[PDB]
Amino acid sequence: PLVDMENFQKVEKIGVVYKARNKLTGEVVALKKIRLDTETEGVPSTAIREISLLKELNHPNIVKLLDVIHTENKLYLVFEFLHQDLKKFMDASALTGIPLPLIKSYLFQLLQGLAFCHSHRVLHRDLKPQNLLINTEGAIKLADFGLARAFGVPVRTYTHEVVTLWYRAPEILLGCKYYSTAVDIWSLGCIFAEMVTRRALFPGDSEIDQLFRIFRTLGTPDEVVWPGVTSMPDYKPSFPKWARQDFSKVVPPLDEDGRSLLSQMLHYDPNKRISAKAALAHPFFQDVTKPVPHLRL
Amino acid sequence: VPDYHEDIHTYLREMEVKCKPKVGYMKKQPDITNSMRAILVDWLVEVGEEYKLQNETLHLAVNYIDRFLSSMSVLRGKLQLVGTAAMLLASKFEEIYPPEVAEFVYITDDTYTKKQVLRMEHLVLKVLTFDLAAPTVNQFLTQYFLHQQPANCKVESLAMFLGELSLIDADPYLKYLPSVIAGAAFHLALYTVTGQSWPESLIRKTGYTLESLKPCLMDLHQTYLKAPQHAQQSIREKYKNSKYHGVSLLNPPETLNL
Numbered sequence: 128p129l130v131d132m133e134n135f136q137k138v139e140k141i142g143v144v145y146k147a148r149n150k151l152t153g154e155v156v157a158l159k160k161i162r163l164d165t166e167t168e169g170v171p172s173t174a175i176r177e178i179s180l181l182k183e184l185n186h187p188n189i190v191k192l193l194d195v196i197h198t199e200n201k202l203y204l205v206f207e208f209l210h211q212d213l214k215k216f217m218d219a220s221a222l223t224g225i226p227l228p229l230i231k232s233y234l235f236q237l238l239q240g241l242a243f244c245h246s247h248r249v250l251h252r253d254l255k256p257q258n259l260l261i262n263t264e265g266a267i268k269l270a271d272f273g274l275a276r277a278f279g280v281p282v283r284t285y286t287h288e289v290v291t292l293w294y295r296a297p298e299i300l301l302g303c304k305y306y307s308t309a310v311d312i313w314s315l316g317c318i319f320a321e322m323v324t325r326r327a328l329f330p331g332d333s334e335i336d337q338l339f340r341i342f343r344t345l346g347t348p349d350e351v352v353w354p355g356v357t358s359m360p361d362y363k364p365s366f367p368k369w370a371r372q373d374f375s376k377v378v379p380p381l382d383e384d385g386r387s388l389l390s391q392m393l394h395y396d397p398n399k400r401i402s403a404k405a406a407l408a409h410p411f412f413q414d415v416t417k418p419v420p421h422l423r424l
Numbered sequence: 425v426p427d428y429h430e431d432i433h434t435y436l437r438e439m440e441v442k443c444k445p446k447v448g449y450m451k452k453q454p455d456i457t458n459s460m461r462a463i464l465v466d467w468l469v470e471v472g473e474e475y476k477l478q479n480e481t482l483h484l485a486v487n488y489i490d491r492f493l494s495s496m497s498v499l500r501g502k503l504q505l506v507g508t509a510a511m512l513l514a515s516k517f518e519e520i521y522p523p524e525v526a527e528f529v530y531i532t533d534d535t536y537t538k539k540q541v542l543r544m545e546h547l548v549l550k551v552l553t554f555d556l557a558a559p560t561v562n563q564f565l566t567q568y569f570l571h572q573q574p575a576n577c578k579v580e581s582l583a584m585f586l587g588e589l590s591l592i593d594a595d596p597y598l599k600y601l602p603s604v605i606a607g608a609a610f611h612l613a614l615y616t617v618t619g620q621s622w623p624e625s626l627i628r629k630t631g632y633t634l635e636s637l638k639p640c641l642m643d644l645h646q647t648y649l650k651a652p653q654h655a656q657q658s659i660r661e662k663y664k665n666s667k668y669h670g671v672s673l674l675n676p677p678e679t680l681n682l
């Protein structure tokens with residue numbers, strides 16, 4: 128275990144995560160270092176979950192966990208190495224925009240990784256642009272499973288372990304009892320739109336602000352749109368009744384198919400929100416291809 | 425009823441065959457015995473009631489324990505250390521808010537050190553090679569419950585109860601798969617509460633027939649009948665609570681008429 132660690136050359140910090148090299152094979156990897164003596168509560172729950180769940184998921188669009196090294200003070204996760212995260216890429220693309228064909232390629236792959244997760248009873252729960260990794264070949268992969276949960280038994284909603292606000296689904300905001308696979312589809316929809324428009328769909332300042340920004344765009348849900356909304360814990364009957372914005376104005380660059388898919392990914396009732404499995408069948412991906420990004424590396 | 429529902433059941437069936445401990449491990453243990461295991465598991469049930477932990481947590485811990493014991497000799501005096509580490513790990517995996525190490529050292533009554541427990545957590549992780557996402561009887565019951573046409577909360581409680589009981593007695597239950605023990609528990613509960621039987625939808629879903637379930641069903645019925653006479657009682661006590669509709673007080677059918 129200490130012999131294994133000796134076999135790694137640290138190249139540079141990328142996240143703590145280091146780009147690293149295997150001295151014997153020449154393989155390039157990402158090392159996620161985890162100090163254990165900073166809490167004295169044992170292996171962290173995030174680590175337990177990330178490792179056990181991740182090593183169950185082998186898929187081209189899910190970051191590959193190559194190895195785990197557990198000494199007495201250190202725990203290391205060895206991952207395949209990728210070149211950058213989507214958040215940085217979107218930043219670099221601000222002036223130009225990300226080409227619609229690449230957006231389609233990315234959303235397509237992300238849905239495949241996510242579909243694989245869900246059909247193996249893993250919720251990611253933290254899908255946001257910086258947790259998505261891309262390489263120079265035009266591949267993109269789901270990463271950071273620190274918040275991931277197995278849902279063979281239903282997963283209870285937790286105040287502290289929540290996805291960052293901007294990508295948080297309305298069920299969660301309105302205080303639902305359990306997570307479902309739908310919260311991941313929501314986050315993806317949010318990311319899809321953001322890649323298209325160069326701006327976050329729902330950049331809320333607070334829980335209630337996040338909620339209203341969603342209401343202002345998609346309309347304030349009612350019992351017809353979403354049976355049960357009015358009964359949900361944090362639903363107030365005193366919410367403003369906004370009307371649903373015209374979708375071509377919300378994502379202008381998108382065609383009919385793209386508007387179609389996005390609105391199904393953003394459907395209010397999580398029972399009705401499209402699934403990754405089904406989203407993949409959508410005519411939007413009729414012509415999908417695999418462009419390569421211009422990475423400013 | 426979700427649509428990854430079917431993919432997932434299939435996957436769990438795939439997995440339950442891999443997480444499987446050696447059925448005869450106990451006669452290869454130099455120092456511990458089924459009885460000692462029963463006492464340990466019944467204790468874990470108690471711990472779970474004290475710390476208000478989920479059933480899934482309990483089920484996962486038993487899995488970890490049975491697997492660890494399939495390849496590690498353990499002495500009487502250390503068996504509880506293994507169980508404690510197992511409970512702690514299962515909590516970290518499944519609970520939203522896992523108790524802290526200290527709390528686990530507290531309930532072993534300072535038999536062991538915070539150090540020992542954390543050292544054993546490490547060892548169990550090594551032995552189990554971080555594969556903690558095991559299929560449980562609990563999980564399959566949850567799947568089976570959706571195919572409950574008239575959804576009935578006493579049936580669910582009673583099935584939970586029967587399935588939890590199987591955790592206690594390594595003989596015979598170590599020789600059945602979770603999906604199967606689940607099938608027996610669902611049917612037996614459903615038959616006791618409503619007189620209905622292992623439904624057509626589940627026969628299709630699982631490929632288990634009432635006939636295939638019979639051997640396990642026979643065992644589970646026996647355990648159910650004898651439950652009040654069993655040396656370990658923590659589960660019956662637990663399932664007297666209002667939360668479980670007092671189902672452990674329900675009288676088991678005299679015959680299954682299979």
Ligand SMILES: Cn1nc(C(=O)O)c2c1-c1nc(Nc3ccccc3)ncc1CC2
Pocket residue numbers: 141142144157159190206207208209210211212260270271272
């Ligand atoms: C940053 N990071 N955090 C985590 C994690 O699990 O928290 C992971 C990574 C990561 N980053 C990169 N490549 C990369 C290179 C340059 C810039 C950004 C990313 N490649 C692999 C991984 C494995 C998991």
